[PDB]
């Protein structure tokens, strides 16, 4: 049939499974090479491996590679789904396995693909039931016993190889474990090229930029990105085209394409599947929103982007990048705002954490959560981890009286060994924010964990002008007013307090607008906030931070600065 | 057939779901368009998404929407529930899943709805059972595999998506996670109209006010409310007539008054006049509260989100909770009253979970006003604690800070604080953006307390004249709570006098002036002068 002709040509292959060549090379070796040239193996006098375990995070290409091998190799293929074999009748799962292996051996020199063995082969010492123990023992004796495996090779796929019987992880049963892992930039580019081979893309789309901007996508998310971009484009073109009660007009199908805007929208919308648990609600901030603190903004941009944008120079200079920063100062100065701006206008992934957000009452579960979040961050690198209000989760362990249950000390030790310990040195930048540095563990503020401690001060005159202009960028204003007097009058306020003044100006303008609007309906009077509203909104203006906390923050600042002396 | 005609009419479909147009748009885009015009998809060269995970609170209309789209489309519908498919023996739950998918793919192009999926996918890590792991693996293999499925769509329903195996929320299994949230005022109006398409109303019936006063009732709640109100009407207008073993001309006069719906909302799951004095505080709070909600268009035009927090501090029994309740009644926003020491816990890391839960509920049920009563108990001075309880207090105050002002979407949530000792609070909550306004509630003057007495006597049977000015001027040191106690004592004295007078007979319908005098003869003062001096000093230093 016509559908069969295209479907037959639609069979996957080696060209379709691009993104990881080394693992592909190993699988190709084992599956084909002893079948193409057995004479060289008998010449060298050894038999090849005949067992594989493909493992990795979900959606990387394991089942796809198995399908590709099935389509390419001319040998007989036998697929076994995981929970397909066992039934209620005692002694039937083993009968099914025996029948499967018997068919494979009797038919031809074949391949057996067993999908999701983590369910069929758990650790015997841990399981309490009996049928699973019997079936795993059956699989062991069937795969490696006496007079077994006459030219048969087994392939396995799993998302969690650790939960496998150790007796299965040895030579003869599963010879070597192929790691089908997260692709790199070139791998993502290759995946994009593969998925955009049959699509009618526009002439203005380049895939290099997309591959560069997408970071932690596992390759199953690239298909999602392509599908979502196609969906946006078709939605846009259908809002124009008629309801199309009949068959779609031939005039629109001849002119179809997907522009860079669709892909960009999908990229801004999509998120890697691994981090879908830790997604952050869409909050919009931009660098133009953060007034003042220009040096800090520039330095943060550099320290977050240079390891990402320019890794070639780093590797040519032969040194690592810096992966830490701490913000400390009076409250409301803009630390959280800087974090939001980073999360919005930085390409690397973002992980947001509240203060106690990961603390549980169970034993060791807080440390389990810490390990989980850092493992996610390391897997989906480059990544930015924001630890808001650090002093809640990381205090001076053992100082004064420790935790009664001794849990704070354990969690801070786990945090220590996750930020600096035996690891693979991935791109994970830790952003810290606190307003009480004296209660922080000295072992966290060391270089290599939190390198540079940036102090955000109260805004000066120019910073006040900058923040006022940033806050009033989108409001409608008359040309008459000038904010320099507003900035000068304060002399001690913070960005939060200036926001409060602007808010009261807005409320007074709102009151006047409603008061002037009601008479129009009873029987656009103030399209902008006038100088009177600002003049009258400061009547209830009071300083936010007192004179006792400010002196403490400053004194800590000079205490830190003094140790830098003698230079 | 008589029932056959109702079968077609009762067939759920479009216009039955109200308040989820965007989500309905996405779902119908996924379900109908590829089945309506597949030639364009074959031309563009990309398979459609074929998996959805609808989530949200229970009883919102997830099953309704799935059934509606399925019945509208020509696809076969098969429903699978959580507990029904899982068993105790070994090796049949996966068989059930396999048979379901097999017959669905064998019969016709079908739409499958797995209701309550969170009971089948426990994440394979926080779970010890073996059958659950095996069924999760079977579900994964059925959804994706060597020629797994074709021309079939799957939808799931859950309340806690986080408690699902991440391998299920991958492209090809669950493509787009649609949020079926609580509906707004417009959604509530349209669902009321939808549910009232067949019932007969009265002339003086409006649904906008009903949508206004109803806050958290969603979907099935609305259906149950309407059904039981109609049933009560039917039962009420059947006993007052003779129980005939009946003329349609008299039966077709049923209607539905408003009082029926009033008590319907009163039994199913104060006012501005009740507060005396505090006029400037009342009007300031009123503007700050209902200006965002009554005029959102102009705020969008100006581009500035409003302030949220307020803090009252002063003597107890003054009416902070009274103002909070008045707000809860005077705006449709939900009210969440939480006491100070209520959130604490001897366990480790549980007060934090409590705070996360209450704030998540407040943000989910927006607009909302959250009343933190006795905030001094939680938000202790973060520095001078020096103890393990001090560490716990530091933890909880940090959680409060990061929750009320943190990486959030800025939903409409208003935090109201109330304390009688404002100088034991960390000055991080008091910064603008968390709790900007510092309102001081003083002891009421003579006119204020007279108005308080008048408001308290709003519905109390009273003589034509009581001369409240004397009692008002003779209680210079009292508070609103104390005045309420005096009024209650007078009422109980009148009640017992009437009971004693009528006992001999078996007398005054209104509280007499003599009764009021002998009730005022006993009184107590709950506030000293030192507390007033402390509050005055705090206000002066502020």
């Amino acid at each position: 049939n016509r559908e069969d002709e295209e479907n037959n040509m639609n069979e996957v292959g080696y060209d379709d499974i691009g993104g990881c060549r080394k693992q592909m090379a190993q699988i190709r070796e084992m599956v084909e090479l002893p079948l193409r040239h057995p004479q060289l193996f008998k010449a060298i006098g050894i038999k090849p491996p005949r067992g594989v375990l493909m493992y990795g995070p979900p959606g990387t290409g394991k089942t796809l590679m198995a399908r590709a091998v099935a389509n390419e190799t001319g040998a007989f293929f036998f697929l076994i789904n995981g929970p397909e074999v066992m039934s209620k009748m005692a002694g039937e799962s083993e009968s099914n396995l025996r029948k499967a292996f018997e068919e494979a051996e009797k038919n031809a020199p074949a391949i057996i693909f067993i999908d999701e063995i983590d369910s069929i082969a758990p650790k015997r010492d841990k399981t309490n039931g009996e049928v699973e123990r019997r079936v795993v023992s059956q699989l062991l004796t069937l795969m490696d016993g006496m007079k077994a495996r006459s030219n048969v090779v087994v392939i396995a796929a799993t998302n969690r190889p650790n939960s496998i019987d150790p007796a299965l992880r040895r030579f003869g049963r599963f010879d070597r474990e192929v790691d089908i892992g997260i692709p790199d930039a070139t791998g993502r580019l290759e995946v994009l090229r593969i998925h955009t081979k049959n699509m009618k893309l526009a002439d203005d789309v380049d895939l290099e930029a997309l591959a560069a901007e997408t970071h932690g996508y596992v390759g199953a998310d690239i298909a999602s990105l392509c599908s979502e971009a196609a969906m946006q484009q078709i939605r846009e073109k259908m809002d124009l085209i008629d309801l199309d009660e009949d068959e779609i007009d031939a005039e629109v199908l001849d002119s179809l394409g997907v522009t860079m805007d669709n892909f960009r929208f999908a990229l801004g919308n999509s998120n890697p599947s691994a981090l879908r648990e830790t997604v952050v609600e869409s909050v919009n901030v931009t660098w133009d929103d953060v007034g003042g603190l220009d040096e800090i903004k520039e330095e943060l941009k550099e320290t977050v982007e240079y390891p990402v944008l320019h890794p070639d120079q780093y590797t040519k200079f032969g040194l690592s990048p810096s992966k830490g920063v701490l913000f400390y100062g009076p409250p409301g100065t803009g630390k959280t705002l800087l974090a939001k701006a980073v999360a919005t206008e930085v390409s690397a992934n973002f992980i947001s954490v509240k203060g106690p957000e990961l603390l549980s009452m169970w034993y060791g579960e807080s440390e389990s959560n810490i390990r989980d979040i850092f493992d996610k961050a390391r897997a989906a690198a480059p990544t930015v981890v924001f630890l808001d209000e650090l002093d809640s989760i990381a205090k001076a362990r053992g100082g004064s009286l420790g935790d009664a249950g001794g849990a704070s000390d354990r969690v801070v030790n786990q945090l220590l060994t996750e930020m600096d310990g035996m690891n693979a040195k991935k791109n994970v930048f830790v952003i810290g924010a606190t307003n009480r540095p004296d209660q922080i563990d000295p072992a966290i503020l060391r270089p290599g964990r939190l390198d540079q401690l940036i102090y955000v001060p109260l805004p000066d005159e120019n910073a006040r002008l900058s923040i006022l202009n940033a806050q009033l960028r989108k409001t409608p204003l008359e040309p008459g007013l000038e904010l320099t007097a507003i900035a000068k009058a304060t002399q001690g306020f913070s960005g939060a307090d200036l926001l409060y003044i602007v808010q009261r100006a807005a409320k007074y303008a709102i009151k006047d607008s409603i008061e002037a609007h009601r008479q129009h309906e009873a029987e656009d009077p103030v399209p902008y906030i006038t100088k009177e509203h600002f003049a009258e909104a400061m009547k209830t203006a009071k300083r936010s931070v007192s004179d006792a906390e400010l002196r403490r923050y400053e004194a800590y600042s000079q205490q830190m600065k003094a140790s830098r002396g003698q230079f | 057939n008589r029932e056959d005609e109702e079968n077609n009419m009762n067939e759920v479909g479009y216009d039955d779901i109200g308040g989820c147009r965007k989500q309905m748009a996405q779902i119908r885009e996924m379900v109908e368009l590829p089945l309506r015009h597949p030639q364009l998809f074959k031309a563009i060269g990309i398979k459609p998404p074929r998996g959805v995970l609808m989530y949200g609170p229970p009883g919102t209309g997830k099953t309704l929407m799935a059934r509606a789209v399925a019945n509208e489309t020509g696809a076969f519908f098969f429903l699978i529930n959580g507990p029904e498919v899982m068993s105790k023996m070994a090796g049949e739950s996966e068989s059930n899943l396999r048979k379901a998918f097999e017959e669905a793919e064998k019969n016709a192009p079908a739409i499958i709805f797995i209701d309550e999926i969170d009971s089948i996918a426990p994440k394979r890590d926080k779970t010890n059972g073996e059958v659950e792991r095996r069924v999760v693996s079977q579900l994964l293999t059925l959804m994706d595999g060597m020629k797994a499925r074709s021309n079939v769509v799957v939808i799931a329903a859950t309340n806690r998506p986080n408690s699902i195996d991440p391998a299920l929320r991958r492209f090809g299994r669950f493509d787009r996670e649609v949020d079926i949230g609580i509906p707004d005022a417009t959604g509530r109006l349209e669902v009321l109209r939808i549910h009232t398409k067949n019932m007969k109303l009265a002339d003086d019936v409006d649904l906008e006010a009903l949508a206004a006063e109803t806050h958290g009732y969603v979907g099935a709640d609305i259906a149950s409310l309407c059904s039981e109100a109609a049933m009560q009407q039917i039962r009420e207008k059947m006993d007052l007539i003779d129980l005939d073993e009946i003329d349609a001309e008299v039966l077709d006069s049923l209607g539905v008054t408003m009082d029926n719906f009033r008590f319907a909302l009163g039994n199913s799951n104060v006012t501005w006049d009740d507060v005396g004095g505090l006029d400037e505080i009342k009007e300031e709070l009123k503007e700050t509260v209902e200006y965002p909600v009554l005029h959102p268009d102009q705020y969008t035009k100006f581009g500035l989100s409003p302030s949220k927090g307020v803090l009252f501090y002063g003597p107890p029994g003054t009416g902070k909770t009274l103002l909070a309740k008045a707000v809860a009644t005077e705006v449709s926003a939900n009210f969440i009253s939480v006491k100070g020491p209520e959130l604490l816990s001897m366990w480790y890391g549980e007060s934090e979970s409590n705070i996360r839960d209450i704030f998540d509920k407040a943000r989910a049920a927006a607009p909302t006003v959250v009343f933190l009563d006795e905030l001094d108990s939680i938000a202790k001075a973060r520095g001078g604690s020096l103890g393990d309880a001090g560490g716990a207090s530091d933890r909880v105050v940090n959680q409060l800070l990061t929750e009320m002002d943190g990486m959030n979407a800025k939903k409409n949530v208003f935090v109201i604080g109330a304390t009688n000792r404002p100088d034991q609070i960390d000055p991080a909550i008091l910064r603008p953006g968390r709790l900007d306004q510092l309102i001081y509630v003083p002891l009421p003057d003579e006119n204020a307390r007279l108005s308080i007495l008048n408001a308290q006597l709003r519905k109390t049977p009273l003589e034509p004249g009581l001369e409240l000015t004397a009692i008002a001027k003779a209680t210079q040191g009292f508070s609103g709570a104390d005045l309420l106690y005096i009024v209650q004592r007078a009422a109980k004295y009148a009640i017992k006098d009437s009971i004693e007078a009528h006992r001999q007979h078996e007398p005054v319908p209104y509280i007499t002036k003599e009764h009021f005098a002998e009730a005022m003869k006993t009184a107590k003062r709950s506030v000293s002068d030192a507390e007033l001096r402390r509050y005055e000093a705090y206000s002066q230093q502020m």
Partner: peptide, 23 residues
């Protein structure tokens, strides 16, 4: 006229531990 058998599993209770804060 033929019999048969069947093996089925059973649930088992599991203990736990929990840290506790204190004053």
């Amino acid at each position: 006229a033929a019999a048969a058998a069947a093996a089925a599993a059973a649930a088992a209770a599991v203990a736990v531990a929990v840290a506790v804060a204190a004053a």
